[PDB]
From TrEMBL, chain A:
PANTHER family cross-referenced by the UniProt entry: IMMUNOGLOBULIN LIGHT CHAIN (PTHR23267)
Organism, scientific name: Homo sapiens
Protein name (Swiss-Prot/TrEMBL): Ig-like domain-containing protein
Location(s) in or outside the cell: Cell membrane; Secreted
PROSITE patterns the UniProt entry points to: IG_LIKE, IG_MHC
Disulfide feature: C22-C90, C139-C198
Keywords: Adaptive immunity, Cell membrane, Disulfide bond, Immunity, Immunoglobulin, Immunoglobulin domain, Membrane, Pyrrolidone carboxylic acid, Secreted, Signal
GO CC terms: extracellular region; immunoglobulin complex; plasma membrane
Matching InterPro entries: Ig-like_dom, Ig-like_dom_sf, Ig-like_fold, Ig/MHC_CS, Ig_C1-set, Ig_sub, Ig_V-set, IgV_Light_Chain
Predominant localisation class: membrane
Ig-like domain location: 3-90, 118-212
Pfam families: C1-set (PF07654), V-set (PF07686)
The protein's assembly and partners: Immunoglobulins are composed of two identical heavy chains and two identical light chains; disulfide-linked.
Lineage: Eukaryota, Metazoa, Chordata, Craniata, Vertebrata
From TrEMBL, chain B:
Keywords: Adaptive immunity, Cell membrane, Disulfide bond, Immunity, Immunoglobulin, Immunoglobulin domain, Membrane, Pyrrolidone carboxylic acid, Secreted, Signal
Main location: membrane
Protein name (database record): Ig-like domain-containing protein
Ig-like domain mapped to chain residues: 3-90, 118-212
Pfam families registered for this protein in UniProt: C1-set (PF07654), V-set (PF07686)
Organism: Homo sapiens
Disulphide bonds in the chain: C22-C90, C139-C198
Compartments in which it is found: Cell membrane; Secreted
CC annotations in GO: extracellular region; immunoglobulin complex; plasma membrane
Domain of life: Eukaryota
Length: 216, 215
């Protein structure tokens, strides 16, 4: 399909500025100046950042500013924040003349954020779950960056080879990542060991938590 | 509140037809017939399916059809196939901003197995944690399909809205989804109430689990 031309990807560190270009904006018929920019976070609708080249909707940060020169338009994001990681699109044209044409999208990554080791919280099966003749351990992994981790489980000190499901890391509201790993056991297996452990490895460093059956 | 509104999620089986609707097209100034539908697969730009209500650009299969009736516009997909599983956004031209405005999007699942309500398991803060002056609650939500849920927490009888995080559902080894919602509180806060509750809504039906301090 036809699109306005953007770079495919851009990247910068917190506090920096990123300028995203968009070529092909000139309207054929007439001389329209109807260029807009949108921000799209994963799984959410695009949000309008600027319109009519350099107007901003209320609510939108003045960190976002639009410009145009001839057949090129530009979005400048100043004072970059981790939350700005998203895809950005330009658009141009009336609607009915040809229509509106969108850019191909630019993916923005914010590099140079600080290393954040994971917090690891380990939960044993509750007495309530054991009343249902089942047992689940949950290893909550939170506040880490970058967003990649590997999880291993042990029964006493031996590797667990079955019953483990680990979720794909998701970026949360503080721009750090979270994931959970859960291990489904029978109450026998649970009671048949002195302890179980969750080992989380992030950026070559391992964090480990252990938990054991209980009385009261 | 959002110029254009569509259902959060819908599902249909292979072969059948499904319609997704957006309301508010008539209230947008100068929208005329400039209503479009977009399909978006993860990691990809949105693909235009229909424009000028019912026109399809090249490449787009005639299984997709757009219509409009008053303040509502709809996308109908016939002979649903697997590849149609995606997010779908309606949009309209918006004379007030000389820009396009989008609906909130609809996650469409093409059912590849029967629906399955979530298993929900709720855990109280562990002893180790309290000792370290923290009190996280975790509401584990697993084996659900389609992969869409909504989570609300209750302190005692009062809904809660602070210290809550929920991960994006991820597909697990049995092709169903799992996510976890954790509520981060102080031991005091934990201590103060006789109950906390985790309420998961999936496919219009809400499931609840409750936990109470040890003892």
């Amino acid at each position: 399909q036809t699109a306005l031309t953007q770079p495919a990807s851009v990247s910068g560190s917190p506090g920096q500025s990123i300028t995203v270009s968009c070529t092909g904006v000139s309207s054929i018929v007439g001389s329209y100046n109807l260029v807009s920019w949108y921000q799209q976070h994963p799984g959410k609708a695009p949000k309008l950042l600027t319109y009519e080249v350099n107007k901003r909707p209320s609510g939108v940060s003045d960190r976002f500013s639009g410009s145009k020169s001839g057949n090129s338009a530009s979005l400048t994001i100043s004072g970059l924040q981790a939350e700005d990681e998203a895809d950005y699109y330009c658009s141009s044209y009336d609607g009915s003349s040809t229509s509106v044409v969108f850019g191909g999208g630019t993916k923005l990554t914010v590099l140079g954020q600080p290393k954040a080791a994971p917090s690891v919280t380990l939960f044993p099966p509750s007495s309530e779950e054991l009343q249902a003749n089942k047992a689940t351990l949950v290893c909550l992994i939170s506040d880490f960056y970058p967003g990649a981790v590997t999880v291993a489980w042990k029964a006493d000190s031996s590797p667990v080879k079955a019953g483990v499901e680990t979720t794909k890391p998701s970026k949360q509201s503080n721009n750090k990542y979270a994931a959970s790993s859960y291990l489904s056991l029978t109450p026998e297996q649970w009671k048949s060991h002195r302890s179980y452990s969750c080992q989380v490895t992030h950026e070559g460093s391992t964090v480990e938590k252990t938990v054991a059956p209980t009385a009261c």
